[model samples]
Target: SVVEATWNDVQLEDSLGMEVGYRLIPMVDFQQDGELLGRIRSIRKKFAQDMGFLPPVVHIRDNMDLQPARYRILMKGVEIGSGDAYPGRWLAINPGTAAGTLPGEKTVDPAAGLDAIWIESALKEQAQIQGFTVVEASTVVATHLNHLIGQFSAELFGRQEAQQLLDRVSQEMPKLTEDLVPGVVTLTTLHKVLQNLLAEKVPIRDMRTILETLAEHAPLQSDPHELTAVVRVALGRAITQQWFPGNEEVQVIGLDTALERLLLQALQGGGGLEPGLADRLLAQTQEALSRQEMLGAPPVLLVNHALRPLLSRFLRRSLPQLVVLSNLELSDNRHIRMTATIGGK
Candidate 1:
């Protein structure tokens, strides 16, 4: 059960907020030396500093209709995740392969769907001794909200947020900011472009680089999608570093030459792939993705620059985990090995 409040009453215009049951008040009561509020504030500060944008203040309030042990995480007044936490109890999670189970109420970890249990606070030591991952009551809520914020970070950015970011940049790079917004690209376009990047899990912490890249290319291309592609290429090194963390070579799935040519032809024709070909492509890509996962490698696909957007959109619907990158997006110093090939006869 949940209760709705008017915007004036809640005044939660921030990016994220939470609604907790009455029994959970102590977890957020600062005077009680509650650790949950401290943890949330620390994460908010780090997220803003690391991500190069101020995440919305998370407004929290008590909900009478909710279960005494339940809480909900909200983004822009909408619930994104909800779960139960027992105050003074410990959450014991089996890392999916524990040998024995602890004596407790069986539950699933809301942050991750791992098998978990709620046990007495006294059993915390026993649970950990048995190889169960243990967390406190407040940790459960904090961790859940952390994951939700990152997952929905793109939605947190709106016109106002974008303008705020622009103003911040102008403080350091006044000329660049002045020449970019409303000169080359409107604030709305830049906002959409940032959203697109964040939607694909790209970090915009390097705003200086992003602004420079957009300023150079926005005048030549006004389409947000096209601008996003060019900006991606400009941020290729960062993207590559994120995907392939170490100096080790990157192993990726590649498209067969014939298939690449066909995809290019389809794009040039201003139409989509043939139905049969599209179906087969998806099937094969799924197979490759599974194989990559089994090998414990990141599932990344490399294609030509022209085919990136086409394949990105086409594959995104079916293979959200698959990272579609253009050849132009790979750093020259890094080596890439074709671990698998798709669409080859």
Candidate 2:
């Protein structure tokens, strides 16, 4: 679904040609092969003499050949064309960037060399960094380019808050659904919690941290119960956000009380309620407070449970590959990069 720039694009650019080269050693001795030896002998006996290099004195150097996708270890570095040079591999000088005039010019621009070098270095750095793809890295670099040029995108930057919410929702949903019924209703409530937390400036650093914090409560439940409770709260928050019943009491319940009520209802409504859902949920809620050695249960439980949905929302939206670059910008600039050389069918 994503479009990518191919190597061919770089090759055909009249004014901007690029090439990537890798040096490798061959496994087998091509000099010993009949066809190769014939070529070598013909060159040595005929070409060497014609070229003024003594034929018989020209020696049989090391027997090595260049092979793609292989490595060779050279002892202390030796100059490629010098007397000690082994017939290992022609010191590869692949065209990294082809030089030519600009699109409409007869001569290269003064900045062409610098630009070409910069592009190569940038490209190489992109490939070297782990956890991010070339495209993603390039986008980041482009965004920063303007800043480096003393310009800024405040409009784009402002939307980062909204982007963070979207990302959190995507990440948290998967974790909630893994061991529980992942209903859309539950997901919506989780989204609301995220919105609420962001409104309060609560940082969704990691889903695991959220889970750990919530699980500190003694009343916290098992994975299944905890997930279900989390989902129920998320659903409640979602509904609450959609409309206000206009009752002060109802509004007072808000995200905190509403979440606990949803959990209580979940426990009550389960026809085949898992044996200890309530106890487990309470334990987890307690763990959250106890782990931090904080006092009181009501406020802590309310706060922790209310915040659980946000964590769930975060995990589903952002995978482990996803890294929250900064609170200032929800854009996940960080990612895990994996590469494979695939052959087309």
Candidate 3:
């Protein structure tokens, strides 16, 4: 007999976890024909597809360690939210001026709400088309929270982000995931590529696309060079859609072969950059990307497929959002207009 995990090891964390009291076990228990499962089913299903990935499961567990009528909801680990619910009685709220209160326990509406309403579009459109874009005032916090997902902590953002990205892909055909970490490719290096993408505010939720690409290519080449570009292009369409949302021209910068011929020679010895070459690329692309940014175009440096990652890694030294894209990745029907260029004669 070797060893075993203690109570602490059982503490491997998860979602809102949804700890229920022992007495409430009947409602939550599976064999007991728990109704809570249906409600729990309804819960995750209630908020449909916000991210490309699956939402974390509720992981319903009835804690015998807590009081019979008491239960709590916790984050990935702990945050005791104390509350009690009755199995026999109903927890109800009085909506308004109707009648007497119900003879049961009452609780607040979780911060409550103020009564409100309004609006008419055709009438108001007549009033404001002088050139105004009117929309709900609640737009800020709305997807600001959603958009905030674009942002990171792992191992607490590093390693945790590292594992989550890996394991998330592992969830399906997990056998592949089993071999993913260094068995095929080093998670550490891929983790860097990942965090690099995340640093540029791209979504990690596309792990399925990213991971499968790695599983596909990791056998031939290890990381960065072949891998990153292929994944970027594989996921490129989605990203391009985000970068340039409409059917308009993609007004961005391009790099001519002056640097390319030079870049290839250096790569033959070691994929490296010379000083002035770096300075020239950085200085010129900065102004171009900035000007295009004001034009409200995506700050992209459209380039040959081979140079995308090398340039991206070097150039990202300053412009984190200066997305270096490959021409091959951009599909047809979309127009490409280089508003600027580097190594342009």
Candidate 4:
């Protein structure tokens, strides 16, 4: 069907705007089946150019915006070319699903999240702490690696069980020997005597008084903690006096082993404990340091592959560098084994 209007010369005026508007409205009205048919061919051509397909068109009546009473009369007047009138209709319907899938539509799971926070926080906290911290423990141990090289290599090749013990001792010795304490004696008594002697202008070249003062404070026991405390106190003094010399580090032993020992000793009493308990201990350490405004960027975590999966998922995600070795090879070939050391950033 088509709207066939063969018109002679027609004059359009604006003074009676309503008549002009009513006449033009029906020509543009898409609801009329005849008018739509008249334009269907052109519409399809434009549709193909724009969307690559011609869509089905529908005509609707009873539009809510325009009153049917007014629209009906306008259509009649226009059809007869008589006077002014209005016309049109409307329709409503639910939309349908897309013919093809849209972009960016995919499924996702929320439960999976990052988990390296714990170790990062621990290292940052340890780093920020000033006096006698494990921040430099790894460096201290590395300096003494020569003493550990034979044992490390031996254990890696599965030639020696004693290598494990040496590894533990090597790892802990650095922290135990940092020597943060000034010396065997309390500084207070040493200062008191020095002040008195200097005030009196006593001859102090013999230095017997200073020696006695230090003897009184010398460490008496071999307890690990006490020994470490003394070492921290005297570490600087020992280094300065050339009393303790450092040996070359075994680079073959990486940070993986060192860090694990640290996590064990510092985080879990150097024992195989539940991760929850270890995490809680580390948290407490971090909290204590943070309260003092001593927190900084967390540490770089170096760990064994076996411990990675369980330890990797933590609150403060750390930068984990993994070291995977064939344990079977380690157990079978004595020379094919490896040992690792770890440190804080």
Q: All candidates' lDDT scores?
A: 0.85, 0.29, 0.59, 0.29
- TM-score of candidate 3 versus the correct structure, residues matched by position: 0.53
1-345: candidate 3 lDDT, tens digit per residue: 578867876657764456767777877778987755665554335322333333355566767788986666554667434455555443233334323322323344221221111123342343233332223312211222222223321112355546775666677657767767778778776876666665554555667787788878888887565676677777777778877887777877876667677776666566566677777777877878777767776677887677776777788867866787788778676988877766554
> Best to worst by lDDT, what's the order?
1, 3, 4, 2
Model 3 local distance difference test score: 0.59
TM-score (all chains, Cα) for each model:
0.90, 0.16, 0.53, 0.15
Model with the higher lDDT, candidate 1 or 3: 1
Query: What digit string (tens of lDDT, one per residue) describes model 1 on residues 235-329?
Result: 99999998998789998988889888877788878566678787888989998887788788889999999988878888986887789998898
Relative to the unseen true structure, what is the Cα RMSD of model 4? 37.7
lDDT of 4 by residue, 1-345 (tens): 476555544543211111223333444355644342344445435533432222222122333344322222112123211211122311111122212222221221111211111112233433233221121211211222222222122112221222332233335454322232234433333333333322221222223323432353445642332322222223223221222123321112233455466544544344345556555534543443333233232122223434432343342232122111212212121232122222342
**Which prediction has the highest lDDT against the true structure?**
1
Q: 3 or 4: which has the higher TM-score?
A: 3
Candidate 4 deviant stretches above 4 angstroms: 1-224, 237-275, 280-345
Residue-wise lDDT of candidate 2 within 97-118, one digit each (tens)?
A: 4333222112111111122111
Q: Candidate 4 versus the native: TM-score? A: 0.15
